[PDB]
Amino acid sequence: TTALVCDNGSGLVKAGFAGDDAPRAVFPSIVGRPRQKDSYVGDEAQSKRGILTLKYPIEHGIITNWDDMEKIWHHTFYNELRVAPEEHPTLLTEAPLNPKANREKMTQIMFETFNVPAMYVAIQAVLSLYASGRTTGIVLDSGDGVTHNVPIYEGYALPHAIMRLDLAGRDLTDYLMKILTERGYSFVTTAEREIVRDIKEKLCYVALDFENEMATAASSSSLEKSYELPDGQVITIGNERFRCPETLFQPSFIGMESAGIHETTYNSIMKCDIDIRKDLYANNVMSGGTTMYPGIADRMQKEITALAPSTMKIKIIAPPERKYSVWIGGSILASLSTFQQMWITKQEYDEAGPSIVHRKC
């Protein structure tokens, strides 16, 4: 045999076995060292954070710390999945526009450190598209650290048209802390950040129209929701519920001058060959945890419709599984009969070295 699928994100690792419906292990992408054992990984590092210095080896989707990434992978195999990686083909994921040296190092580590019999690296957005049951479309993938638009045709990403936006879930969490503090609460500490992340994931939503929603919130309590803090205090969340994710559509709310996600989607489509643009408009797939806000699909449909030609058929696909669709795509790909010739084998590695990844992946 059974292949392993490891989707390594800025915030969370999603890992499991090809053929499972969902990842067995989902844990924070963190390694902590004493300010016992020599290091801790994942939730244990999080729970023991008070006595550790934490490192986050994936930044904006890119692996930036190889010693700590090795610790994350080792923890995934040995602790979380209870597998010997030398016994399983292993499929890893990577960010769009991942540098060649980076994919080489991933490959080197899998074969030399973990002794895998075979491996493959796939682009996260491409896997998400596969999970949606198609090979052509444009993915908006938004996680904890980065957002990308990735147009894909007949299974392959179109690098010249990929858009990267360094605004994602962590920025939204921080903004929600800020605006709840402005309301008169105080959310400033590291523990309070975790609480506000929960508030964000439970109560936020994307308004179909920002102004209408602000007006409703100003003139009634109909949008207000209660939230109980760990210690039992009950607070009220009002327009913050939709003001937080509104930032995706209007990054200026946090002082970023970037185009919002509807505009980046349009701009990415317009970088592609005119002949495939209708295929992209008709197959906008949302992926990643920061696309989980209720209302986001209807809002994207509205905004893209306003930008596109009047005759254009537009469809937003926002699967309920989209927190884990990258992982699911890896699972179905690794399981597919026609994929089995595509693995990089140990022999292929021994006879080419790490740069085999550019040819095979």
Ligand SMILES: Nc1ncnc2c1ncn2[C@@H]1O[C@H](COP(=O)(O)OP(=O)(O)OP(=O)(O)O)[C@@H](O)[C@H]1O
């Ligand atoms: N229901 C929800 N509503 C809003 N945000 C959510 C929801 N569920 C999870 N998130 C957010 O999604 C992010 C995690 O998503 P994901 O696992 O896709 O990111 P990642 O792969 O770790 O990061 P990246 O793709 O940026 O490298 C977090 O910021 C989390 O708070």
Ligand SMILES: [Ca+2]
């Ligand atoms: Ca991700």
Ligand SMILES: [Ca+2]
């Ligand atoms: Ca702006």
